[PDB]
Amino acid sequence: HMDVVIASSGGGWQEAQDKALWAPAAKALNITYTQDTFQNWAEARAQVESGSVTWDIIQIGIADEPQAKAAGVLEKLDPDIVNKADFPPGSVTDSFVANSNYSTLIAWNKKTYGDNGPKSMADFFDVKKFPGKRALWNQPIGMIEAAALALGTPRDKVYEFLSTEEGRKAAIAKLTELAPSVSVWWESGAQAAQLIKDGEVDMIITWGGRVQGAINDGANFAYTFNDAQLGTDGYAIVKGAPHRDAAMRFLKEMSKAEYQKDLPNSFATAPANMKAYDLAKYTPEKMATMASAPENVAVQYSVDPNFWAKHAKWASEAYDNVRLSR
Ligand SMILES: NC(=O)CC[C@H](NC[C@@]1(O)OC[C@@H](O)[C@@H](O)[C@@H]1O)C(=O)O
Ligand SMILES: [Ca+2]
Numbered sequence: 001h002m003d004v005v006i007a008s009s010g011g012g013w014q015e016a017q018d019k020a021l022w023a024p025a026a027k028a029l030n031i032t033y034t035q036d037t038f039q040n041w042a043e044a045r046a047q048v049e050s051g052s053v054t055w056d057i058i059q060i061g062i063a064d065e066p067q068a069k070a071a072g073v074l075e076k077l078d079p080d081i082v083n084k085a086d087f088p089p090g091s092v093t094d095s096f097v098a099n100s101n102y103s104t105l106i107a108w109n110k111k112t113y114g115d116n117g118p119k120s121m122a123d124f125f126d127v128k129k130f131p132g133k134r135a136l137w138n139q140p141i142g143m144i145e146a147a148a149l150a151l152g153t154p155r156d157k158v159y160e161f162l163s164t165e166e167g168r169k170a171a172i173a174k175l176t177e178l179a180p181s182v183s184v185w186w187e188s189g190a191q192a193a194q195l196i197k198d199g200e201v202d203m204i205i206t207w208g209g210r211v212q213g214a215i216n217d218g219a220n221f222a223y224t225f226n227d228a229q230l231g232t233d234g235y236a237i238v239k240g241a242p243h244r245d246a247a248m249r250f251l252k253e254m255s256k257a258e259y260q261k262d263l264p265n266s267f268a269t270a271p272a273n274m275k276a277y278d279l280a281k282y283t284p285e286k287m288a289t290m291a292s293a294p295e296n297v298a299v300q301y302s303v304d305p306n307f308w309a310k311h312a313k314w315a316s317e318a319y320d321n322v323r324l325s326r
């Protein structure tokens with residue numbers, strides 16, 4: 001009840017944040033903290049709506065931020081919590097501080113397809129060319145866009161296509177056509193990593209760090225950055241946080257280059273603080289696994305928070321219908 005409560009999505013990703021950021025920053029500030037886990041920012045909304053907020057810091061996505069901010073779920077962060085020039089443009093708002101870049105990408109089972117696995121969203125959606133069990137997230141960010149890409153939309157026109165009612169309906173129709181081949185709608189990064197380790201799916205759209213972690217654990221899977229979504233993860237403080245002031249100081253400390261440099265030590269993620277790269281001096285081998293590496297960025301498209309700030313409610317309901325058809 002006296003400790004700052006920080007929450008992310010568990011598994012290897014939470015363990016990496018706790019080791020590189022939370023435990024060293026709390027030690028430097030001589031403070032005590034408690035961890036929690038959640039999969040959707042709507043759980044932070046529920047706390048705000050119930051009138052009993054227990055979480056202080058929440059780890060959310062860059063495209064969750066406009067929605068959460070509009071719903072009054074987030075506190076406004078103190079000015080100069082970070083220097084905006086040290087982070088990618090748009091990754092730091094008045095209610096969010098980025099901690100990393102990651103990819104929502106295609107991974108496939110080498111026992112099923114060998115080296116000849118799906119290398120694009122058109123291939124992921126091609127049950128004729130690639131027969132097998134698919135796994136998709138139970139939340140729509142990266143999933144609606146995957147269907148738009150599968151329909152032939154160029155990566156740079158994804159959100160131009162999803163700007164019309166016609167494009168949005170076509171993306172849902174493409175997901176509905178794929179739905180009978182979707183054996184599991186994964187709910188957490190650790191569950192997606194477990195599906196990969198057990199070879200329970202033939203192909204999956206999930207986060208790069210989770211995929212690489214499963215492969216490091218022995219999974220006979222391969223993956224590509226082609227047609228992947230370049231995402232941004234970060235921190236926000238819950239509106240009415242019981243330890244708001246202490247949380248603000250903790251978030252300021254953990255955003256520093258000295259902690260950020262250690263974030264990809266074992267977990268395949270890309271630090272958001274640009275000064276971390278100079279401090280750590282990552283090997284080319286290390287850089288190649290990073291979502292934000294130039295060669296990887298070249299075959300990706302960035303998530304658009306402006307799209308999600310407008311059509312999240314529609315996407316949630318329509319995507320729920322696609323999954324509820326099973
Ligand atoms: N930054 C990273 O490298 C990790 C990427 C990825 N994070 C995705 C996430 O932030 O997306 C929005 C929310 O669903 C979160 O629960 C989740 O941790 C993961 O958990 O694997
Ligand atoms: Ca994991």
Ligand SMILES: [Ca+2]
Pocket residue numbers: 013102189207208209210211268
């Ligand atoms: Ca990951």
